[PDB]
Amino acid sequence: MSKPQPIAAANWKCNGSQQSLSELIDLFNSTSINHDVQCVVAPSWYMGAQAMTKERLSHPKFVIAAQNAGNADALASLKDFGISWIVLDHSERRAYYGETNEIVADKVAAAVASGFMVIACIGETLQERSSGRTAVVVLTQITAIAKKLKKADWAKVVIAYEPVWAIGTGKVATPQQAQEAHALIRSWVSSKVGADVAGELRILYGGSVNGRNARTLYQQRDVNGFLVGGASLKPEFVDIIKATE
Amino acid sequence: MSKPQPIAAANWKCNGSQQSLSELIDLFNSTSINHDVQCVVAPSWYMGAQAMTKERLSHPKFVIAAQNAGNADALASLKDFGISWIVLDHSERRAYYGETNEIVADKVAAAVASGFMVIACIGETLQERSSGRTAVVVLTQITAIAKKLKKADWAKVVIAYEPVWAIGTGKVATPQQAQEAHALIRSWVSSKVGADVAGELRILYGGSVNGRNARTLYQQRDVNGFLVGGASLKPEFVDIIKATE
Numbered sequence: 001m002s003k004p005q006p007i008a009a010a011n012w013k014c015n016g017s018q019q020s021l022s023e024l025i026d027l028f029n030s031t032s033i034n035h036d037v038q039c040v041v042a043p044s045w046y047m048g049a050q051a052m053t054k055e056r057l058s059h060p061k062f063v064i065a066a067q068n069a070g071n072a073d074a075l076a077s078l079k080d081f082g083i084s085w086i087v088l089d090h091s092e093r094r095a096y097y098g099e100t101n102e103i104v105a106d107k108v109a110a111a112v113a114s115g116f117m118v119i120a121c122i123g124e125t126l127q128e129r130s131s132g133r134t135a136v137v138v139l140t141q142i143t144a145i146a147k148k149l150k151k152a153d154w155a156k157v158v159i160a161y162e163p164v165w166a167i168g169t170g171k172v173a174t175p176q177q178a179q180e181a182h183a184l185i186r187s188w189v190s191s192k193v194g195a196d197v198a199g200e201l202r203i204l205y206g207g208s209v210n211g212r213n214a215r216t217l218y219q220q221r222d223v224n225g226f227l228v229g230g231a232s233l234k235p236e237f238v239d240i241i242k243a244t245e
Numbered sequence: 246m247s248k249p250q251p252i253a254a255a256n257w258k259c260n261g262s263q264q265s266l267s268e269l270i271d272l273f274n275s276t277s278i279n280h281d282v283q284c285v286v287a288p289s290w291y292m293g294a295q296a297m298t299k300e301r302l303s304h305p306k307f308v309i310a311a312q313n314a315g316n317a318d319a320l321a322s323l324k325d326f327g328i329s330w331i332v333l334d335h336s337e338r339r340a341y342y343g344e345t346n347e348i349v350a351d352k353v354a355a356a357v358a359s360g361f362m363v364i365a366c367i368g369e370t371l372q373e374r375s376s377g378r379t380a381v382v383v384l385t386q387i388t389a390i391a392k393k394l395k396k397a398d399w400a401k402v403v404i405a406y407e408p409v410w411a412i413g414t415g416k417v418a419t420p421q422q423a424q425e426a427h428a429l430i431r432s433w434v435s436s437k438v439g440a441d442v443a444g445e446l447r448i449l450y451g452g453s454v455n456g457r458n459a460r461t462l463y464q465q466r467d468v469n470g471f472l473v474g475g476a477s478l479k480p481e482f483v484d485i486i487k488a489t490e
């Protein structure tokens with residue numbers, strides 16, 4: 001496959017049930033995973049979730065990611081607290097309130113500068129998809145991001161293709177849709193910065209991934225794992241991790 | 246007597262029912278309030294929360310607040326979007342990941358500088374309370390905040406005493422506990438900036454406030470209203486507003 005190390009990311013934004021979380025991490029801690037894969041849990045600070053996660057999470061293949069970073073103080077605070085991954089949900093921020101492509105690019109470049117691994121979420125809206133503007137839209141986003149990055153910075157970067165219309169809607173991208181978007185994203189990185197880097201970049205798919213559909217998505221040449229919301233708050237997440245083999 | 250205008254603030258962080266919100270604001274829009282009180286709703290941009298609120302909210306005594314501001318761009322963006330109040334959950338940020346007192350002070354000073362009204366949340370952890378360190382801890386936080394403020398800036402500032410151990414836990418501060426903390430806060434302000442300013446400052450209580458317990462809390466000499474999470478996502482919030490008479 002010569003695929004790089006896959007990633008399986010649990011997006012725990014705004015979760016309600018905190019006893020539920022502790023149990024989840026218990027399950028994760030005891031889950032034997034038989035292949036090379038980076039697992040990520042991205043709890044909110046909201047309630048005890050992030051603090052508890054930091055405390056209880058012990059599985060060697062898991063790291064903790066934060067939801068968004070702004071100013072280097074917040075970043076430095078995160079470093080201090082022991083968190084070194086960040087998820088930037090640009091796809092959504094752009095969609096819901098028009099966050100700028102340059103803003104996320106600045107965020108990425110800054111987070112990387114402070115030595116974070118960064119999961120950058122890019123994607124088109126339902127509108128844009130129907131219009132046939134996926135490629136234009138996605139290419140614009142990756143282009144903006146790349147502008148602010150040196151070749152070596154890509155080692156600290158992970159891209160998540162996360163079409164907004166697929167987020168929490170039950171509407172999953174078909175394998176062909178994901179594969180096209182990922183291929184498209186990689187090709188731009190190859191062009192801009194080199195086939196070597198482009199090859200090492202993980203591009204994760206996000207949006208209504210579950211244990212039933214994960215395996216077939218991962219089979220796609222340019223899919224390197226998943227960003228998972230709803231299905232990551234369930235024992236099902238384990239199936240998703242294993243779909244990345 | 247002579248309390249300044251009370252505030253009733255609905256903290257809608259990370260809420261998980263969107264149709265539920267629209268209905269809430271409908272109820273608020275039609276709610277007749279028979280006294281002078283500033284109401285505040287603090288929706289997340291997450292989902293349509295904030296954008297919908299901006300669109301549907303019409304009640305004359307309500308304003309919209311944002312959850313946290315960083316860099317003057319984000320602030321300017323907020324001004325542009327028509328939002329001019331901010332809630333800074335320092336109590337929590339400090340507790341969950343160790344946010345610095347000086348960081349929140351800088352945030353306050355900056356938000357005020359951009360012409361925002363600021364609700365600064367300060368408070369001690371369960372640990373600090375049990376240890377008997379409430380006063381030390383709370384005083385340290387207000388002190389930090391004050392260092393970055395000129396006398397005139399206090400007109401743009403609102404303090405919320407929000408003990409972390411009372412947040413979303415069902416454990417409400419007793420009236421005496423809230424009264425002590427508020428009195429302590431006000432007496433510092435009186436000393437280090439003046440009785441006049443100290444007299445005008447609203448100090449809100451936050452942490453497991455509901456319709457049953459609000460009235461008795463508000464009766465306390467130094468309580469100027471409430472920061473409400475869970476109970477602010479229910480029709481109950483109306484009872485809380487009326488408890489402020």
